[PDB]
Design an enzyme around this catalytic site. Structure first.
Site, mmCIF file in Angstrom:
data_model
loop_
_atom_site.group_PDB
_atom_site.id
_atom_site.type_symbol
_atom_site.label_atom_id
_atom_site.label_comp_id
_atom_site.label_asym_id
_atom_site.label_seq_id
_atom_site.Cartn_x
_atom_site.Cartn_y
_atom_site.Cartn_z
ATOM 1 C CB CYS A 171 -1.914 15.468 -19.943
ATOM 2 S SG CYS A 171 -2.525 13.931 -19.538
ATOM 3 N NE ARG A 182 -0.190 18.264 -22.718
ATOM 4 C CZ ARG A 182 0.614 19.260 -22.737
ATOM 5 N NH1 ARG A 182 0.389 20.366 -23.075
ATOM 6 N NH2 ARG A 182 1.602 18.428 -23.177
ATOM 7 C CD1 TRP A 212 -8.198 6.115 -21.874
ATOM 8 C CD2 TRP A 212 -9.405 7.830 -22.584
ATOM 9 N NE1 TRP A 212 -8.002 7.038 -23.561
ATOM 10 C CE2 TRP A 212 -9.002 7.849 -23.480
ATOM 11 C CE3 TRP A 212 -10.653 7.974 -21.516
ATOM 12 C CZ2 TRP A 212 -9.382 9.343 -24.542
ATOM 13 C CZ3 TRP A 212 -11.727 9.244 -22.736
ATOM 14 C CH2 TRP A 212 -10.995 9.659 -23.824
ATOM 15 C CD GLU A 235 -1.154 6.012 -17.155
ATOM 16 O OE1 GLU A 235 -1.621 7.260 -15.934
ATOM 17 O OE2 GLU A 235 -2.213 5.979 -18.071
HETATM 18 C C1 HEM Z 1 -8.266 10.738 -20.817
HETATM 19 C C2 HEM Z 1 -6.625 9.744 -21.362
HETATM 20 C C3 HEM Z 1 -6.099 10.211 -20.319
HETATM 21 C C4 HEM Z 1 -4.365 9.648 -20.684
HETATM 22 C C5 HEM Z 1 -3.761 8.704 -21.742
HETATM 23 C C6 HEM Z 1 -3.251 10.135 -19.351
HETATM 24 C C7 HEM Z 1 -2.035 10.160 -19.874
HETATM 25 C C8 HEM Z 1 -1.407 10.402 -19.050
HETATM 26 C C9 HEM Z 1 0.306 9.682 -18.081
HETATM 27 C C10 HEM Z 1 1.313 8.205 -19.209
HETATM 28 C C11 HEM Z 1 0.832 10.340 -17.700
HETATM 29 C C12 HEM Z 1 2.027 10.136 -17.085
HETATM 30 C C13 HEM Z 1 1.875 10.559 -15.391
HETATM 31 C C14 HEM Z 1 2.790 9.327 -14.954
HETATM 32 O O1 HEM Z 1 3.131 8.817 -15.400
HETATM 33 O O2 HEM Z 1 3.020 9.126 -13.415
HETATM 34 C C15 HEM Z 1 -0.524 11.188 -17.230
HETATM 35 C C16 HEM Z 1 -0.107 12.748 -16.646
HETATM 36 C C17 HEM Z 1 -0.754 14.013 -16.110
HETATM 37 N N1 HEM Z 1 -2.634 14.184 -16.536
HETATM 38 FE FE1 HEM Z 1 -3.478 12.855 -18.017
HETATM 39 N N2 HEM Z 1 -3.931 11.199 -19.250
HETATM 40 C C18 HEM Z 1 -5.156 10.820 -19.741
HETATM 41 C C19 HEM Z 1 -6.876 12.120 -18.910
HETATM 42 C C20 HEM Z 1 -6.447 13.385 -18.523
HETATM 43 C C21 HEM Z 1 -7.392 13.965 -18.000
HETATM 44 C C22 HEM Z 1 -8.682 14.595 -17.769
HETATM 45 C C23 HEM Z 1 -6.444 14.923 -16.930
HETATM 46 C C24 HEM Z 1 -7.267 16.035 -15.948
HETATM 47 C C25 HEM Z 1 -8.331 16.864 -16.330
HETATM 48 C C26 HEM Z 1 -5.059 14.887 -16.985
HETATM 49 C C27 HEM Z 1 -4.135 15.518 -16.078
HETATM 50 C C28 HEM Z 1 -2.614 15.172 -15.582
HETATM 51 C C29 HEM Z 1 -2.409 15.831 -14.879
HETATM 52 C C30 HEM Z 1 -1.879 16.953 -14.624
HETATM 53 C C31 HEM Z 1 -1.064 15.030 -15.188
HETATM 54 C C32 HEM Z 1 1.066 15.576 -14.976
HETATM 55 C C33 HEM Z 1 0.098 15.715 -13.002
HETATM 56 C C34 HEM Z 1 1.954 15.551 -12.493
HETATM 57 O O3 HEM Z 1 1.922 17.056 -12.875
HETATM 58 O O4 HEM Z 1 2.588 14.909 -12.172
HETATM 59 N N3 HEM Z 1 -5.162 13.598 -17.907
HETATM 60 N N4 HEM Z 1 -1.275 11.373 -18.232
HETATM 61 C C1 LIG Z 2 4.647 7.131 -10.475
HETATM 62 N N1 LIG Z 2 4.443 9.233 -10.635
HETATM 63 C C2 LIG Z 2 3.778 9.401 -9.562
HETATM 64 C C3 LIG Z 2 3.937 10.695 -10.120
HETATM 65 C C4 LIG Z 2 2.408 12.098 -9.577
HETATM 66 C C5 LIG Z 2 1.636 12.582 -8.688
HETATM 67 C C6 LIG Z 2 0.205 13.464 -8.803
HETATM 68 C C7 LIG Z 2 0.488 14.000 -7.892
HETATM 69 N N2 LIG Z 2 0.049 14.659 -6.688
HETATM 70 C C8 LIG Z 2 0.003 12.832 -9.814
HETATM 71 C C9 LIG Z 2 -0.087 11.992 -10.925
HETATM 72 O O1 LIG Z 2 -0.786 11.935 -11.821
HETATM 73 C C10 LIG Z 2 -0.281 11.633 -13.386
HETATM 74 C C11 LIG Z 2 -1.408 11.366 -14.002
HETATM 75 C C12 LIG Z 2 -2.639 12.118 -13.169
HETATM 76 C C13 LIG Z 2 -4.129 11.860 -14.051
HETATM 77 C C14 LIG Z 2 -4.233 10.857 -14.962
HETATM 78 C C15 LIG Z 2 -4.777 10.625 -16.071
HETATM 79 C C16 LIG Z 2 -6.688 11.392 -15.474
HETATM 80 C C17 LIG Z 2 -5.603 9.163 -16.454
HETATM 81 C C18 LIG Z 2 -4.489 8.782 -17.086
HETATM 82 N N3 LIG Z 2 -5.034 7.504 -17.744
HETATM 83 N N4 LIG Z 2 -3.187 8.854 -16.672
HETATM 84 C C19 LIG Z 2 -2.976 9.824 -15.139
HETATM 85 C C20 LIG Z 2 -1.639 9.986 -14.574
HETATM 86 C C21 LIG Z 2 1.586 11.665 -10.935
#
Ligand code: HEM
Ligand SMILES: CNCCc1cc(C#N)cc(OCc2ccc3c(C)cc(N)nc3c2)c1
Ligand code: HEM
Ligand SMILES: CNCCc1cc(C#N)cc(OCc2ccc3c(C)cc(N)nc3c2)c1
Ligand SMILES: C[C@H](O)[C@H](O)[C@H]1CNc2nc(N)[nH]c(=O)c2N1
Ligand SMILES: C[C@H](O)[C@H](O)[C@H]1CNc2nc(N)[nH]c(=O)c2N1
Ligand SMILES: [Zn+2]
Lengths: 411, 409
Positions: free
Chosen positions: B108, B111, B280, B285
């Site tokens: 993430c 964070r 957000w 994304e």
């Molecule tokens: C508030 C602004 C946030 C932004 C800008 C953000 C951004 C991102 C981005 C760009 C990814 C890449 C995943 C993808 O491209 O598919 C990601 C993954 C992830 N985010 Fe954040 N996120 C935010 C908030 C949060 C919050 C509130 C949580 C949970 C409390 C969280 C938990 C996660 C987790 C667990 C992943 C990875 C899931 C996996 O392992 O596939 N995010 N995030």
């Molecule tokens: C195209 N990539 C898909 C891989 C993926 C799988 C899962 C699951 N399960 C969850 C995933 O979550 C990524 C993620 C999770 C949380 C987010 C939040 C809370 C905010 C944000 N802007 N992006 C997120 C992005 C991604």
């Protein structure tokens, strides 16, 4: 133990059995991944197993495994290690070794071409002048008036580590960088340190923004010497843009031949500390890294200005926008001058085909995702959604310490 | 074994000590790196060390390690485990657990905001209708009229694996995916299967293409139930371009609230199978991913075509040029409508700061370079030249099987 990689764009799955032939180590453990770390004197004791493994590989590839030719060769190498504590590769072996080192280079997106490497055996070389001569012929052969050809030149192997051949340049052709008193840099910021060494060794720097550096060459453990590549051998391409007439006025050019010269070729325990190799450029290497990286020419801003971009807020993506245009101009320039280049879309597509072909005929293809994915437009290239296994196979290219940090000076 | 990471753009070196407190495993070995692989019930004996590990870090974080309070709680949880074969988190532990599950999410980039999570304790919930209510309240609070706030809503913990709470949607808000007889798809190709499963269980699709999917909620291991989120709770942004006013007529919009709902939250051994969380969007994304990804909208072709770019050979970089404009537009639209969004330059710069902070106050920060680096313009963002160490800390968010493969019907 069979391992699977999935392509999440095409749901294609491949099965890697080749990782079991992995000897070396990754730096990773079951509790830590060092996948994004850039970097993670040999006795007869541990040499013959390294030798045997290599010769077993070689004789396998020519379908003579366990032949009398194979067994005699092992015996012959053994006695030579037993009596001389090293051994010499036959020409066939050296060629195989060089081609497979490239094939095994898991960070190289251009490996579809690996089997078409032109190997120059310079193991008879003894002096820097003779090194200079071998390198000139490499550059001339590889350049081929714009129709680039993959080539590697191999200098004598390390012995007691006190008589090393080294090419001190990181690439055969590269532009100087000069730290100005006011803190600014003239030329290529990437090359400031090496430029300074050269200057100390008596190079007369023209102090221009695009001066080709001299070759600094070390033979047999002796102090390195300065040579000037003949300007007519250095093929350069002026950079212009196909719609933007003012781009030419930025005064940029770049050399056509990418030729890396500071790495180490390992073949069957033998170490070739000087082994310059060359192919041709992927456009983003020049256009993304060599111009736009903040620790480089950084024309990014000046391109953005001349495009009259909104450079206040980054959310305008003026940075992204200028980057695309500069890479457009780089490709445009090289193609217009019939100098071999490949765009990142073509190269990544080619690599995916290579990789699939490798899994089918070899049972795997080691690959470093962090390095294979292009430095711009990542997700719209097909390597991005491609899972990859990274492991280390021999023969290989390896890093080695900068010679100026380890060299003992004669005077 | 006190590992160092280098930024090659700045030569800043950080020393990672935190990785030594890693419990879980990466998937890699000395012989092979799996850093690019997407995806690598508990007994009484397994549970108590997990509880102790969690309670030990909790009481250290409140500077009451080895205290009467600490020891009190340890004995307390220990006793409940031997009796009930599980245990219940105090509210404070739940909040700490949740926030730290985000802190430890190595993939993430967002964070830096980790400690400002709004936790909604939904452990008293018993039905899908109840889940729907907790979820509508989450969506409305998180959205906040475009001024988005981070939040997680936590439903009852797994018991014996037969009474699982599950949100079957991958996100709370996602557009439907319908494949036409023609061959291709309209709506959203990522959701094609799930869009079928909803209809397969009684949804009546508006078969437009920006149809907000229904919620499919599973309480206590029962058959899941369809629910329609009130449209006035679903904030959407029409996508226009600041310079190209032909852009509006592509007919695009996206929803403001990214809210992931299919992951499992693990705290001190306990398994929260339903725990939708939301923040957000980073601009990419939606634009580099939810428009141009060949396995999704893939409108790149259409866009370049009326940029009238030379789409004859890849070397013109028309895809690249279009990719940039689409993303400029996404950002422009959101900002225009005062819906929260961050661009990839800003988020990555934020993360570098966050990273430095975590090395300074925590001694490390697990990070997965492969996911932290944005899907466009990677090398002109600060994270690209940043070495990162990836390892698994707990509490954590984890993947879990899709319910329809599992749920006994
Ligand atoms: C508030 C602004 C946030 C932004 C800008 C953000 C951004 C991102 C981005 C760009 C990814 C890449 C995943 C993808 O491209 O598919 C990601 C993954 C992830 N985010 Fe954040 N996120 C935010 C908030 C949060 C919050 C509130 C949580 C949970 C409390 C969280 C938990 C996660 C987790 C667990 C992943 C990875 C899931 C996996 O392992 O596939 N995010 N995030
Ligand atoms: C195209 N990539 C898909 C891989 C993926 C799988 C899962 C699951 N399960 C969850 C995933 O979550 C990524 C993620 C999770 C949380 C987010 C939040 C809370 C905010 C944000 N802007 N992006 C997120 C992005 C991604
Ligand atoms: C012929 C066309 C070739 C292309 C288009 C190509 C492309 C690339 C690119 C883009 C990289 C990433 C480097 C960076 O971005 O900093 C790379 C790495 C690498 N290439 Fe290739 N290459 C080619 C030929 C060769 C040849 C001929 C060799 C050796 C004989 C070779 C060996 C390597 C090695 C060893 C690396 C890893 C460098 C490292 O580990 O730091 N390549 N290549
Ligand atoms: C911005 N990256 C700098 C890091 C780097 C270090 C070393 C070394 N030593 C060698 C490097 O070279 C990679 C490489 C090697 C050979 C190449 C050939 C033969 C052709 C080509 N187009 N690119 C190459 C790229 C890079
Ligand atoms: C195969 C590849 O590693 C995989 O698709 C990853 C790569 N990096 C990613 N990065 C982000 N931000 N999101 C993703 O879904 C992915 N996918
Ligand atoms: C820290 C990071 O791993 C390092 O800067 C790598 C990332 N990926 C790269 N990828 C390529 N092609 N070339 C590079 O020099 C790098 N640098
Ligand atoms: Zn790894």
């Amino acid at each position: 133990r069979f391992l699977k990689v999935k392509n999440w764009e095409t749901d294609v799955v491949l099965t890697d059995t080749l990782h079991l032939k992995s000897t070396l180590e990754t730096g990773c453990t079951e509790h830590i991944c060092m996948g994004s770390i850039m970097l993670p004197v040999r006795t007869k004791d541990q040499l013959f197993p390294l030798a045997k493994e290599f010769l077993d590989q070689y004789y396998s590839s020519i379908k003579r495994f366990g032949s009398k030719a194979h067994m005699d060769r092992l015996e012959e190498v053994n006695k030579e290690i037993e009596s001389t504590s090293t051994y010499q590769l036959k020409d066939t072996e050296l060629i195989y070794g060089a081609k497979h080192a490239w094939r095994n280079a898991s960070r190289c997106v251009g490996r579809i071409q690996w089997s078409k490497l032109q190997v120059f055996d310079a193991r008879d070389c003894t002096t820097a002048h003779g090194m200079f001569n071998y390198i000139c012929n490499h550059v001339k052969y590889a350049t081929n008036k714009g129709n680039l050809r993959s080539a590697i030149t191999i200098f004598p192997q390390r012995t007691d580590g006190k008589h090393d051949f080294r090419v001190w340049n990181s690439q055969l052709i590269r532009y100087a960088g000069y730290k100005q008193p006011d803190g600014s840099t003239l030329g290529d910021p990437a090359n400031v340190q090496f430029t300074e060494i050269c200057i100390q060794q008596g190079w007369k720097a023209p102090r221009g923004r695009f001066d080709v550096l001299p070759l600094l060459l070390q033979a047999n453990g002796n102090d390195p010497e300065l040579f000037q590549i003949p300007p007519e051998l250095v093929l350069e391409v002026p950079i212009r843009h196909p719609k933007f007439d003012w781009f030419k006025d930025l005064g940029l050019k770049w050399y056509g031949l990418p030729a890396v010269s500071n790495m180490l070729l390992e073949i069957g325990g033998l170490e070739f500390s000087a082994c310059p190799f060359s192919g041709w450029y992927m456009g983003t290497e020049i256009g993304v890294r060599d111009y736009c990286d903040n620790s480089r020419y950084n024309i990014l801003e000046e391109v953005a200005k001349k495009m009259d971009l909104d450079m206040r807020k980054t959310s305008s993506l003026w940075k992204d926008q200028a980057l695309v245009e500069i890479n457009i101009a780089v490709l445009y320039s090289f193609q217009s001058d019939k100098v071999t280049i490949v765009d990142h879309h073509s190269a990544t597509e080619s690599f995916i085909k290579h990789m699939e072909n490798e899994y089918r005929c070899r049972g795997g293809c080691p690959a470093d995702w962090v390095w294979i994915v292009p430095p711009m437009s990542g997700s719209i290239t097909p390597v991005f959604h491609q899972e990859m296994l990274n492991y280390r196979l021999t023969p290989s290219f390896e890093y080695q310490p900068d010679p100026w940090n380890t060299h003992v000076w004669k005077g």
